[PDB]
Coordinates of C-alpha atoms and ligand atoms in Angstrom, one line a residue:
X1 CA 89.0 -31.9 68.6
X2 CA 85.7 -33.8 69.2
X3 CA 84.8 -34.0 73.0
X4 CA 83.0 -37.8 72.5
X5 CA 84.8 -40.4 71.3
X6 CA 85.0 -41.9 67.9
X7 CA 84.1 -45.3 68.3
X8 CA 81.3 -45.2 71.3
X9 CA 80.4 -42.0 71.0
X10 CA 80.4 -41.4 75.1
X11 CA 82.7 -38.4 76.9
X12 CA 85.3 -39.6 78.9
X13 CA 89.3 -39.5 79.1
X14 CA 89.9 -39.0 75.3
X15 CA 93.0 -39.3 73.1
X16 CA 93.4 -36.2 70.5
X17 CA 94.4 -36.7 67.5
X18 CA 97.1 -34.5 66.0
X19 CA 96.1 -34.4 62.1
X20 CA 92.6 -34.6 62.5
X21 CA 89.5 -33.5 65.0
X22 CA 88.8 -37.3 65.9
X23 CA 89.1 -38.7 69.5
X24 CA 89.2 -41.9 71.3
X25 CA 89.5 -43.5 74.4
X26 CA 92.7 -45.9 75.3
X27 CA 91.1 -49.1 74.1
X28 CA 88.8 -47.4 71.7
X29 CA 91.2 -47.5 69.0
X30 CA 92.8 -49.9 67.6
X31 CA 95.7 -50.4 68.2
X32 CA 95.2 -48.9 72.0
X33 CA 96.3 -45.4 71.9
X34 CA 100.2 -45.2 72.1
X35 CA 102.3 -43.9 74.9
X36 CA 104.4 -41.2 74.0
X37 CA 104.5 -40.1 70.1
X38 CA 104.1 -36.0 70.0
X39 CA 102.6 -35.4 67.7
X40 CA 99.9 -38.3 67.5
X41 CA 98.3 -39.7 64.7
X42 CA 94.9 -41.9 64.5
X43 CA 94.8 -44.6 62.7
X44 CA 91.7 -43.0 60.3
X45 CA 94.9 -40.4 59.5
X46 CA 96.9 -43.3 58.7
X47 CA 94.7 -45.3 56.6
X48 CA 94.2 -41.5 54.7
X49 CA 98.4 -41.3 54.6
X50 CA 98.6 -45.1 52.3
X51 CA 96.2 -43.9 50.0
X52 CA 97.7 -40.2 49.1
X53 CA 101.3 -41.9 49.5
X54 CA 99.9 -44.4 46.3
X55 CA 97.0 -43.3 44.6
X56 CA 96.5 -46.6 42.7
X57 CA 96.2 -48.8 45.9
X58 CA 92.3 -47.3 45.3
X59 CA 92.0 -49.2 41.6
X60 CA 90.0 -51.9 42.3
X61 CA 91.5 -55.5 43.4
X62 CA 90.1 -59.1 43.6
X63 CA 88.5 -60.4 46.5
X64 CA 90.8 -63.7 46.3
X65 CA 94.0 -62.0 45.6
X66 CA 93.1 -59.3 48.7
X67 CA 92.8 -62.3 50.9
X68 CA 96.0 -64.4 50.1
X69 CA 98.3 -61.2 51.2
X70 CA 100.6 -62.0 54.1
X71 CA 99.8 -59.6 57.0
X72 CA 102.9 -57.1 56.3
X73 CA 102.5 -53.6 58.2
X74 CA 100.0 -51.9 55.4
X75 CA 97.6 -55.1 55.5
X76 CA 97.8 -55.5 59.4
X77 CA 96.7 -51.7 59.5
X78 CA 94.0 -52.2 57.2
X79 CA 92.6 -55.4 59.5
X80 CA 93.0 -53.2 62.4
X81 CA 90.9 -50.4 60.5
X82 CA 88.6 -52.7 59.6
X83 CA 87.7 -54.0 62.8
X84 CA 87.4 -50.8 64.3
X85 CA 85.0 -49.9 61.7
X86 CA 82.9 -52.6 63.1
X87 CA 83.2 -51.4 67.0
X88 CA 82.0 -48.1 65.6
X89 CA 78.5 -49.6 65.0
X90 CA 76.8 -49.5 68.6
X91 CA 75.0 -53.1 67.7
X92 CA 78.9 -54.6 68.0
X93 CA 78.1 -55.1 71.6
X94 CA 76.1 -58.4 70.7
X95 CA 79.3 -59.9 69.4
X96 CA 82.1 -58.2 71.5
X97 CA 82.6 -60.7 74.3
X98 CA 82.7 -64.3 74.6
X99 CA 79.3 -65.7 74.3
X100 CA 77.5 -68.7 76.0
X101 CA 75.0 -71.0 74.1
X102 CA 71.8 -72.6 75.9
X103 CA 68.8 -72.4 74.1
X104 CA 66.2 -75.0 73.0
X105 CA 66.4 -76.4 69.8
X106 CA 69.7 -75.3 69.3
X107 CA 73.3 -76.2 69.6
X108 CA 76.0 -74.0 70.0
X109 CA 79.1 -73.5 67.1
X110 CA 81.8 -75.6 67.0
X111 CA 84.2 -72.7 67.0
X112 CA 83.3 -69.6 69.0
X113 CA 84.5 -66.3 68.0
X114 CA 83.9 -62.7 69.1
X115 CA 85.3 -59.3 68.3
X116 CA 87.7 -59.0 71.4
X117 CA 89.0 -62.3 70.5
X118 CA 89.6 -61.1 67.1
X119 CA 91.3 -58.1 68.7
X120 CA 93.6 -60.2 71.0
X121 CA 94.6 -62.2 68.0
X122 CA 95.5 -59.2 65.3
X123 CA 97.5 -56.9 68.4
X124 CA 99.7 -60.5 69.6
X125 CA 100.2 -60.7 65.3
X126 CA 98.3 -64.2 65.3
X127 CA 97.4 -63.4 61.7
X128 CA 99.8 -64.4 59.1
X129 CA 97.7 -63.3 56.4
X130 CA 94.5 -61.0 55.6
X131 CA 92.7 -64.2 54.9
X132 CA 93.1 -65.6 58.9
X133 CA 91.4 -62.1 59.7
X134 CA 88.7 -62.3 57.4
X135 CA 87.7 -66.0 58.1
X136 CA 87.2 -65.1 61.9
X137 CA 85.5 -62.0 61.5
X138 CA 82.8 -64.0 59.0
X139 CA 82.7 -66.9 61.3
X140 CA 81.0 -64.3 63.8
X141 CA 78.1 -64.0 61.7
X142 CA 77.9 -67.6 60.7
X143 CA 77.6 -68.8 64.2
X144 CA 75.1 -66.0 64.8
X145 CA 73.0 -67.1 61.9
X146 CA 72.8 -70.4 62.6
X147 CA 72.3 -70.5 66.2
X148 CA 69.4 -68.3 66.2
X149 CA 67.2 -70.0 63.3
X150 CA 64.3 -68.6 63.3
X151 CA 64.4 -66.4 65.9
X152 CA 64.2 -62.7 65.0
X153 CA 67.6 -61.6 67.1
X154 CA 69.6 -63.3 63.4
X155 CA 69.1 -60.3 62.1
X156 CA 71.2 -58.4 64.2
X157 CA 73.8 -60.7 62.8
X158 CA 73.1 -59.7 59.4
X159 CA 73.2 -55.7 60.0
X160 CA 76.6 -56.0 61.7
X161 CA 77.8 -58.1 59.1
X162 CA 76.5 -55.7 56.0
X163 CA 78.9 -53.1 58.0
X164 CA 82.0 -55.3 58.3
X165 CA 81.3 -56.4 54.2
X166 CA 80.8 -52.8 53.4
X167 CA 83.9 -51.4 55.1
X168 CA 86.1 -54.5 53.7
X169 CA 85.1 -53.3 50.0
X170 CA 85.9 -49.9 50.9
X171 CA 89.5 -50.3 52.6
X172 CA 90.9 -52.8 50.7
X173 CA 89.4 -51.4 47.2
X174 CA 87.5 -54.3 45.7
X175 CA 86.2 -54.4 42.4
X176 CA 83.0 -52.9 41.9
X177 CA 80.5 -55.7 40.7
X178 CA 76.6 -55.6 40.1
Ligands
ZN1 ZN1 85.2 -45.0 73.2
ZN2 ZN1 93.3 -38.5 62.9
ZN3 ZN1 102.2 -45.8 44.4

């Protein structure tokens, strides 16, 4: 197995996987590493298991028709993935925790929204489709973009979401387009 974990990339008490050399700390992974379960699986092995169990959930799908599936077992893995994905990029610390608003010339959002929040809300099953998740995850960004403006720190908005877009095309197998 890996000595650093997955997601942060620090040492520390790490979680083994059983299938594959990945591991994690507790919280780390998502969902937080389970209690008993000999042997353990990660939920990279999991995602891996969907695919090879049906090879054609990789044929490309619609954006719109991805989005109005109701947050059964696969789909709520696939969110969890997703996010995780996300925490895997070290510039997720900007949008991990709840934020505060007080600069000049700006006003803050009208509806908050950070990754632990987003966390909280797919582990208590808040989501009752992939749509719920998307829209929150997205709304990060949007509130990052406009609350900065001009100011140079937008960007780091748009690099974390080009990860999160990326990694949504990727798990739930959208349609190639140019
Ligand atoms: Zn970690
Ligand atoms: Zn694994
Ligand atoms: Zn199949």
């Amino acid at each position: 197995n890996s000595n650093i974990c997955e997601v942060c990339n620090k040492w520390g008490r790490l979680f083994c996987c059983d299938t594959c050399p990945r591991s994690f700390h507790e919280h780390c992974h998502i969902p937080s590493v389970e209690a008993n379960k000999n042997p353990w699986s990660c939920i990279f092995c999991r995602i891996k298991t969907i695919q090879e169990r049906c090879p054609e959930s990789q044929s490309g799908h619609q954006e719109s028709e991805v989005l109005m599936r109701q947050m059964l077992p696969e789909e709520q893995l696939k969110c969890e993935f997703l996010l995780l994905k996300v925490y895997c990029d070290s510039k997720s610390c900007f949008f991990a925790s709840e934020p505060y608003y007080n600069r000049e010339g700006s006003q803050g959002p009208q509806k908050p929204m950070w990754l632990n929040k987003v966390k909280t809300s797919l582990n208590e099953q808040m989501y009752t489709r992939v749509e719920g998740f998307v829209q929150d995850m997205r709304l990060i960004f949007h509130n990052h973009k406009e609350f900065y403006r001009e100011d140079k720190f937008t960007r780091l908005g748009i690099q974390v979401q080009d990860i999160f877009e990326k990694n949504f095309r990727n798990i739930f197998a959208i349609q190639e387009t140019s």
